[PDB]
Amino acid sequence: QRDISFKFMPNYPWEKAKDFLELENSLSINRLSISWRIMVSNFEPAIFIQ
C-alpha cells in the first residue's frame, strides 16, 4: 500500500522433513522463525526483523 521494498524469506520446518514421522514432528513444532528484510529507501540501509 505504501510502496516499501521488502523480502519475505520464510523457512518452514515441514520443508526439511526426511520422512513422514519427521513430517509429524515438524507440524507439532512449538515455535518457528521467519526472517524479513525491509528496504525503506535506496540510500537508507536495510532494516530487518525476524
Binding site: 515441514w14 522433513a17 520422512d19 513430517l23
Partner: protein, 53 residues
C-alpha cells in the same frame, strides 16, 4: 459336557495373544514431496517470497 469342554479349549486357543501382526493393507503410496509442495503452496498464499539467507 464333552462339547462344552472342547469349545472351551478352542476359545482358550483363540484367546492366546500370539497374533503378533496386523492385517496391513497398505500399497497406496505417500508421494511426500507433493505434500510438502502443497503445504508450502497453501502456506504462502498471496505472499511474495524470497530466497534463503
Amino acid at each position: 459336557q464333552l462339547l462344552d469342554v472342547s469349545r472351551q479349549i478352542k476359545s482358550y486357543w483363540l484367546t492366546n495373544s500370539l497374533s503378533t501382526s496386523f492385517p496391513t493393507v497398505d500399497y497406496s503410496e505417500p508421494d511426500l514431496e507433493k505434500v510438502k509442495r502443497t503445504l508450502t503452496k497453501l502456506q504462502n498464499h498471496l505472499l511474495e517470497v524470497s530466497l534463503i539467507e
